[PDB]
Amino acid sequence: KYRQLRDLHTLDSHVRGIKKLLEEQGIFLRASVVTASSGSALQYDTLISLMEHLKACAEIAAQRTINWQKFCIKDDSVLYFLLQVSFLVDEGVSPVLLQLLSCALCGSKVLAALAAQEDQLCTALVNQLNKFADKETLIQFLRCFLLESNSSSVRWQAHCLTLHIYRNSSKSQQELLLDLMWSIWPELPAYG
């Protein structure tokens, strides 16, 4: 129990800090949507203070994934918030956000195999993310992390994350996701 209390409190505090930091620069999460008032990019100090929190969260989620999954179940506005904020932050931080999403959704043993109760938690988290996320945000995620990214590791992470989001969904959401991908397809020549 002791490890669970420590981990839950630490992750809670880190999310409060991240939300306060983003609020300081005009990034507002009202009900479930993240809105930006200023089109100017963030500064180095803000990025480093974000990265320390996200690195702590990534380490704790990678060591003991169950507590992180339990957190994301308890607080329903965490995974979608990270997905939304991954659009506003430069390419230097996106790997850690994708790692957090992958640990929450793809699972721990799957990532361990790639390195060569959790199933129900993964299913529930995937259903929650499907419920919150709309079609435009999914389209933006696919376009931004599978086509526009110059790094190949980020593209592979997006590949795995999309695959495991597809695997754990229901039939109607699978059809919706396939239609989204097939509508993206005609824009292929722009990415080579």
H or E stretch at 34? strand 34-36
117 CB contacts (<8 Å, ≥6 apart)?
66
* CA pair distance 161, 111, nearest whole angstrom: 11
CB 148 within 8 A of CB 105: no
* CA pair distance 90, 93, nearest whole angstrom: 6
Method: cryo-EM
CB 114 within 8 A of CB 61: no
* CA pair distance 35, 60, nearest whole angstrom: 28
HEC letters along 147-158: HCCCCHHHHHHH
* CA pair distance 77, 69, nearest whole angstrom: 13
* CA pair distance 92, 107, nearest whole angstrom: 24
CB 126 within 8 A of CB 162: no
* CA pair distance 42, 22, nearest whole angstrom: 10
* CA pair distance 188, 147, nearest whole angstrom: 8
Query: CA dihedral in degrees (28, 34, 156, 136; nearest 10)?
Result: -160
